[PDB]
Amino acid sequence: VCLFLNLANDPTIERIITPRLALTTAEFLAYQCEKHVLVILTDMSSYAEALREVSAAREEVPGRRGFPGYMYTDLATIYERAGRVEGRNGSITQIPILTMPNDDITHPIPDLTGYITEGQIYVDRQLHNRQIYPPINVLPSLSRLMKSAIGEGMTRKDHADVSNQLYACYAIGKDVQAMKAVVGEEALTSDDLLYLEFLQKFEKNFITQGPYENRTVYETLDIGWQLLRIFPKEMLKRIPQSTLSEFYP
Amino acid sequence: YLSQPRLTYKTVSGVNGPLVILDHVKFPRYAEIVHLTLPDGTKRSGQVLEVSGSKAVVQVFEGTSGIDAKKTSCEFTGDILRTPVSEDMLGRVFNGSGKPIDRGPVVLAEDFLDIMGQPINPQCRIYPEEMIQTGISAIDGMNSIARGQKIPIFSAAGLPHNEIAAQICRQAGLVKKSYSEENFAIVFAAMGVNMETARFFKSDFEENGSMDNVCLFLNLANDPTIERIITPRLALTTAEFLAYQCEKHVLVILTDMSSYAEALREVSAAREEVPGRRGFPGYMYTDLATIYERAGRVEGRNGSITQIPILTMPNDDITHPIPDLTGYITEGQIYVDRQLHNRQIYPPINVLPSLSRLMKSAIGEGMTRKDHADVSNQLYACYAIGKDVQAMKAVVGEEALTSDDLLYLEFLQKFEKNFITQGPYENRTVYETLDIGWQLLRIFPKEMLKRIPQSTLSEFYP
Amino acid sequence: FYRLKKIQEKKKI
Amino acid sequence: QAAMGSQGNLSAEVEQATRRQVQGMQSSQQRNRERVLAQLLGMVCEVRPQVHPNYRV
Amino acid sequence: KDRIEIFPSRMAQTIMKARLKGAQTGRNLLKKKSDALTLRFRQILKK
Amino acid sequence: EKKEKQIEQQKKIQMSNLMNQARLKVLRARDDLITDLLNEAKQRLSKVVKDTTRYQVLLDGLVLQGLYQLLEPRMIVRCRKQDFPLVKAAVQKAIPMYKIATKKDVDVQIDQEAYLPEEIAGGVEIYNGDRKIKVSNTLESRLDLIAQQMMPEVRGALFGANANRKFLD
Amino acid sequence: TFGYVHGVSGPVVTACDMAGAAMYELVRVGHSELVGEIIRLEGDMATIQVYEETSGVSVGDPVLRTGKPLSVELGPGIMGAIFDGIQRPLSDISSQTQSIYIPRGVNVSALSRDIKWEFIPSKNLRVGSHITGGDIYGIVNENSLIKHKIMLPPRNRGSVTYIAPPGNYDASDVVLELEFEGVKEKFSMVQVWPVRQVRPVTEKLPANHPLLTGQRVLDALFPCVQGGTTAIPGAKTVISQSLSKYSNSDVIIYVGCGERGNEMSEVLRDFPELTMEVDGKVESIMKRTALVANTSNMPVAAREASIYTGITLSEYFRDMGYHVSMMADSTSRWAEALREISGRLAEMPADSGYPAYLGARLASFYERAGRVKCLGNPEREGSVSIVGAVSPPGGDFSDPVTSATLGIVQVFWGLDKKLAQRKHFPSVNWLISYSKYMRALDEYYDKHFTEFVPLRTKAKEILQEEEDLAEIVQLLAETDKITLEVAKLIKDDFLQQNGYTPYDRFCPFYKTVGMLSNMISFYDMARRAVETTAITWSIIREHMGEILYKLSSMKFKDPVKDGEAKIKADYAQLLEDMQNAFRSL
């Protein structure tokens, strides 16, 4: 580990230079030493605040929420420094952490970060209030596993289908949960109760994972199938025929 | 007149965006027009926007590309913008800047008029009495338009408001009570429109033969913005002349005034003014006043003007400044309903929320027919109640329905199927609209028609 | 609005 | 076919009418060209130089 | 509780406006259903 | 019914097309001959310019007009080469008038190294010493100017008034 | 002449003693000679927007005025190539430098200056002929499919003086001379065209031939024409190569103005491997396309320039006589770039902080597409299509970008309020989704398909119907049920394309026809009344559960593997199954 430290007591202006040093060093280790590195940035909001200081001092034209215009370019500079290259080994995987003012998804900083990075993993206070150690709201999350987790040569073939079906069922579960607060439990059909039960067991088993638990991908796929088994086969609107007949029985 | 030679400047203080700063200018006038010679010889024009001391400011319509500091030159006509005018402009199509887009030549100037104009004398105003047939059943029957009533047509993007405008242009005319249609013309002016739906205006107007009594203006979306500012005022000046200097009624239509608002914002940004509400300039209200209320009847004359602009709704924001102000300055309004457009009804005009302010005097015994007001009131009530009955049957179920409500449902469905539907190439005189309305009314017994006095039922219902 | 007016006023210098 | 013949007749008539307009027009030209040219040539002579009214010393 | 927790934006205005219109329509319909049911009740009482 | 109305409206479309063509023919005839009249006016002016006894007076007058238009300390004038004798005389006549009109002094010069193209019908060009301001008081420019402004008068005198015009103001 | 730099402020550069330059004349800056374009003039001072990071620039360094404004080289070899926004031949530079780093290489000819080309002059030209120029005088033979041609630059017309014979040339050798004026002129196989101008045309013609895509939403309820103007809320992009594969197009242009770096390497990687194979002979798509490349970190000026050079190439291939389909990854990035530059210049912004003339610039971006009679002796036609993209920000429906685009484009598709199903790209909002080509495609479809009109109107009606009811339902009648589950079935199977899968790589017309026809028939055979025609919804469900599973699994009929006859026979068999099931009730 090579590590850097900018503490709250330090002068604010240093945060402008702090992350670029780490990125340059990581770039060197990745494209030169052919080492597979993992760069962890945190608290980019403080970077935004420092940039706000610099701009406001110079009386430059401000924009949305007093943020200067050009941090879109600046964040582009700080973000994309990653990915492999031809004829070389090693790589750069970049997981930054962004704190979120209040609960504003439309705030400028997270929004602009959304336009640059190819994914996002969301954290919700609701799950944290429900005592879930990884409180991760899967509905707004999204990534470009879009052709990485194929299954042909990768882990297993069913990956996308099970993921999609869980996603859709979870969405409908949230929907019926919302409908539940409107009308009492008696008005629900059997399928609605099935969706509610599937939802409940889903956060109780799939999402709720203990610290230090190293689940394997096959294990999680099997857990997913066990969750699928709650419904009969005819509600598997998304899984193709072949996989459905292969695994459901 | 200008008996002096024009001036030619070579001084160019600098360039900044779509503006040009000059120096050593002798007695510059505020709104005088200028021409520019380029290094390659290309010609251009602009208007003087800001003047102070010997410094002057000029905005360029064609865009400030390639202008140098020594090779370019300037010219001063020493006069604000003036336009020619004459009766013979009918049958001609222009681009708004006075240049005829048609293959024809430049029109001769019977007279020259100041583009800005001057306001009306309130004492000379006269309450409109007559009305204008529109060729749409809903517009003529549900509502009406006096000779001097100003009504906008609210719509939204993706709705066929251009097509309603085109049909109005094709069908416009005065009702023959039994001094001809030669006393009726139209001035259609479209602003900031797509290339498509613009050549469409040209072709649809040319095929039918409407060119005899239409003066057309086209301003493309890609044109200079100041042309967009100028154009509607030019068309209103032409209508003014043709309607007041010559004894003729006229019906001016304007399309996509939101683009005019956008160009107003453009010029406001050019002159460095602080935006007001929602970014629109704070003096938008005065401007929209100046554009409107150039119509009506006056003492000692016979000509008239009737104004029908088209507005686009920014995502159904009824509190958006543009529609709100236009409502505050206009009488009544007409809506276009999206659900009808989904239902594939060629005229998507809605009925319940619309309203005409001056309908009470635009019709009467001296006009087409005595019955019309009662018919309109009765069918208005019937349509509203029928919509409510459809809402009932949505929940209660037809099994708990009465015969009267069944007749109301019949009235609703047949109204939608027949009356409101018009067709792109169908014509209906007002008498036919009244007759169809009576056909609709006939379904109920005479007693169920509470709103109509027994007299009218005695004459007409049999 | 306030921020824009401030910068506009400062633009004079 | 009758309409085609009518179109031919109408084209002939309209061309004739436009022609008649033209000869009446050039007749007016012959009548008034001398006087319009006279007044124009008069108008392009007198100068009466005049400083700007606003100018001062 | 006094307010539905949503961050202010123009989208919020449009969505809340739609929900409000919906609430009025649903209220109006349920009122009408109640009227009909009362009528049937009274009709039973009459005989 | 359908066939009959289709035939009738098609005939009407053809009629309207013919009327449109007629209108365009009339308009282009109008403008062809007004162009010709302007050409004739130009020829008459090019004839008039030759007479020296009035040309000298007109030259004095237009030079003084340019004087009153420019109003700067340093000015120069340009003209045709064979008109050089007259223009200097015009200048000496002009100076006292400007001196009594503006109560300012001006240095005036004559361009003896460059002069107007042979094709120009007449008139002069005035510049500053720096040659940044100039007024093009040429005969052709003034002819065009007078042609444009007087144009409604030309139409009224050449066609007669429009009967539809119930009043001028 | 040389001036001296006077100041640096980010990507702006204030220089002195540059009096006499136009505000779009290019300039070289510093000893590295970075490319620049003027913005503002003031006295002798000038303002220069650069196309490169300004680090290490010292005040006073020389600046070299160049006589031309920004321009784009044209000629053969354009097809099967990749450039950046300023027309940078990255392949050549990567070969030349043997490094993954881009130096400040500002001296690299965009087109190869060494590869020879097979010139075949037209037969009709004659020496000394007074044709007064024109457009065509040649054909280049160096392409299997895209028969490149050599045309005459516009605004240059005159009589033949010398013509080269057929043979190989390096594209700088003069092959045509037109003096015509006492001054001799020479022409090469490559010309130069200013980027910001508009190439003139003879006449703008209409668009009636339809454009058919691989998406069910667009083909179904939002028809698009060949050469028309469209906007796509890309939040998919596979449609581009789908059109290259299937649509009747010739030249494909894609501009990644602001694409994320990973996905741009993705396109660059996967794109060249696709194969086309009309006549049974496999041919790569790379020959019938050309790419523009811009990650998100590049200087703002390049992002501005990319979107224009794309259209310039599109108009070149419009004059080339073919048909072109162009699409831009995201206009919103271009708008953001315009915001950035405008704020940098210290001007007065408009609503939302966007510069006012955003709308005018977007209009200029459009109005450069459609069918057209071209300028030339061999009177011929060409087309350009434009498919812009909209990225809905947090203000999905109120940002000025969507407003301005909404006021121009002819066909618009939008997504609804952001659903919890974030992966639900095929959403449609009826509030702002529309198409104005419904009338123009009637005369095409009356002789191919006439059944889909009532079906489409019914689909719109039913979609409207649950749109109206879902509000109350959140807060019943049998018809309400039938309609609701029918609409959900439509939304889940007819819509909700994954896009990436063997079962949605492309959906031809017949598959859509079968899907929607069967769905609407299933709706009709129950909606009529309580009975089969003029029980409850649950008994229908329990009887026809298997049938409903078949309705949902209709989408799994791969066209690439299963022949069309098998799939339509299957649809008909399942239709008979529905008929039997309903008649037994």
The DSSP line for G339-380 is: HHHHHHTT----GGG--TTHHHHHHHHSSS-S-EEPSSSS--
The neighbours of chain B, by the rule of 3 or more Cβ pairs under 8 Å, are C, D, E, F, G
Angle at G481 between CA G476 and CA G486, to 5 degrees: 165
CA-to-CA distance for G106 and G85, rounded, in angstroms? 13
CA-to-CA distance for B438 and B461, rounded, in angstroms? 7
D29 contacts F44? CB cut-off 8 A: no
Question: Do A69 and A63 contact (CB within 8 A), yes or no?
Answer: yes
Identify residue B135 by its one-letter amino acid code. G
CB atoms within 10 A of CB A150: 14
CA gyration radius for chain A? 23
Angle at G200 between CA G196 and CA G206, to 5 degrees: 115
Secondary structure tally for chain B: helices H, strands E: 13, 17
CA-to-CA distance for A229 and A236, rounded, in angstroms? 10
Using a CB-CB distance cutoff of 8 angstroms, which residues of chain C are in contact with residue G348?
A: 4, 8
CA-to-CA distance for A187 and A191, rounded, in angstroms? 12
CB neighbour class for G356 (10 Å; exposed up to 12, middle 13-18, buried from 19): buried
CA-to-CA distance for G235 and G394, rounded, in angstroms? 13
What are the structure tokens assigned to F131, written together? 């040659």
Contacts of G412 (CB under 8 A, 6+ apart): B157, B158, G230, G231, G405, G406, G432, G433, G434, G435
CA-to-CA distance for G227 and G221, rounded, in angstroms? 18
CA-to-CA distance for B263 and B274, rounded, in angstroms? 16
What are the structure tokens assigned to G506, written together? 């492309």
B8 phi-psi bin (left φ>0, alpha ψ -120 to 50, beta other):
beta
Resolution in A: 4.3
Give the three-class secondary structure for G535.
Answer: coil
Chain centre to alpha carbon of residue G388: 6
Strand G251-256, strand G323-328: pairing = parallel
What are the structure tokens assigned to A224, written together? 């997913």
Please give the backbone phi and psi of residue G383, each rounded to the nearest 5 degrees, phi first: -145, 150
What DSSP string runs through B127-190? ----B-B-S-HHHHHTS--BTT----EEE-TTS-HHHHHHHHHHH-B-------GGGEEEEEEE
> Going edge to edge, which strands form the sheet with B304-312?
B93-94, B214-220, B184-193, B249-255, B304-312, B153-155
Residue whose tokens read 């484009």: G409
What are the structure tokens assigned to G213, written together? 């895509």
Question: Do G171 and G187 contact (CB within 8 A), yes or no?
Answer: no
Using a CB-CB distance cutoff of 8 angstroms, which residues of chain F are in contact with residue B91?
A: 20, 23
CA-to-CA distance for G171 and B327, rounded, in angstroms? 65
First CA to last CA across chain D, in angstroms? 84
Handedness of CA A173, A178, A184, A189 (dihedral sign): negative
Residue among B1, B2, B3 with most chain D CBs within 10 A, to mutate: B3
CA-to-CA distance for G557 and G501, rounded, in angstroms? 12
Question: Do B305 and B132 contact (CB within 8 A), yes or no?
Answer: no
> Chain A: which residues have CB within 8 Å of chain G?
61, 63-64, 69-70, 72-73, 76-77, 80, 82-83, 85-88, 105-106, 111, 115-118, 139-142, 144, 146-147, 164, 167-168, 171, 174-175, 179, 182, 234, 237, 240-241
> Going edge to edge, which strands form the sheet with G149-151?
G149-151, G136-140, G117-121, G167-169
**Length, in residues, of chain C:** 13
All structural domains of chain B, each given as residue ranges with its CATH number in brackets, are 1-462 (3.40.50.12240)
Instruction: Tell whether E9 is within 8 A of chain A (Cβ).
Output: yes
SS (H, E, C) G47-66: EEEECCCCCCCCCCCEEEEE
Residue whose tokens read 């013309």: B185
Q: Which of G516, G445, G452 is nearest to G225 (CA)?
A: G445
CA-to-CA distance for D33 and F43, rounded, in angstroms? 14
A162 phi-psi bin (left φ>0, alpha ψ -120 to 50, beta other):
alpha
Handedness of CA B53, B54, B55, B59 (dihedral sign): positive
Run of H or E residues at G17: none
Question: Do B253 and B104 contact (CB within 8 A), yes or no?
Answer: no
CB atoms within 10 A of CB G190: 18
CA-to-CA distance for E11 and D49, rounded, in angstroms? 68
**Length, in residues, of chain A:** 249
Chains F and D contact (Cβ–Cβ under 8 Å for 3 or more pairs): yes
Nearest CA-CA distance, residue E10 and chain G, Å:
7
CB neighbour class for G143 (10 Å; exposed up to 12, middle 13-18, buried from 19): middle
CA-to-CA distance for G495 and G413, rounded, in angstroms? 14
Residues in a beta bridge with B100? B94
Question: Do A44 and A102 contact (CB within 8 A), yes or no?
Answer: no
What DSSP string runs through G505-532? S---HHHHHHHHHHHHHHHHHHHT-SSS
The neighbours of chain E, by the rule of 3 or more Cβ pairs under 8 Å, are A, B, G
Chains G and F contact (Cβ–Cβ under 8 Å for 3 or more pairs): no
Residues in a beta bridge with B74? B9, B36
Per-residue b or e along F14-50, where b marks 16 or more CB atoms closer than 10 Å to that residue's CB: bebebbbebbbbbbebbeebbeebeeebbeebeebbe
Question: Do B218 and B255 contact (CB within 8 A), yes or no?
Answer: no
Residues in a beta bridge with A136? A123
H helices of G407-508, in order, are 442-445, 452-474, 478-489
Question: Do G257 and G334 contact (CB within 8 A), yes or no?
Answer: yes
Question: Do B281 and B268 contact (CB within 8 A), yes or no?
Answer: yes
CB neighbour class for G439 (10 Å; exposed up to 12, middle 13-18, buried from 19): exposed
Chain centre to alpha carbon of residue B39: 41
Question: Do B228 and B288 contact (CB within 8 A), yes or no?
Answer: no
Question: Do B418 and B379 contact (CB within 8 A), yes or no?
Answer: no
Q: Which of B189, B322, B337, B328 is nearest to B251 (CA)?
A: B189
State the Cα torsion D40-D46-D47-D48 to the nearest 10°: -140
CA-to-CA distance for G506 and G500, rounded, in angstroms? 9
CA-to-CA distance for G490 and B102, rounded, in angstroms? 50
Residues in a beta bridge with B216? B93, B188
Contacts of B183 (CB under 8 A, 6+ apart): B174, B247, B248, B249, B303
DSSP at B5: P
Identify residue F156 by its one-letter amino acid code. G
CA-to-CA distance for A96 and A98, rounded, in angstroms? 7
Report in angstroms the alpha-carbon separations of B92 from A187, B40, B187, B227.
69, 32, 11, 18
- Cross-chain CB nearest to G421 (options A146, A171, A241): A171
Chains C and B contact (Cβ–Cβ under 8 Å for 3 or more pairs): yes
CA-to-CA distance for B212 and B90, rounded, in angstroms? 6
Question: Do G324 and G251 contact (CB within 8 A), yes or no?
Answer: yes
Contacts of B55 (CB under 8 A, 6+ apart): B13, B21, B22, B23, B25
Nearest CA-CA distance, residue B390 and chain G, Å:
14
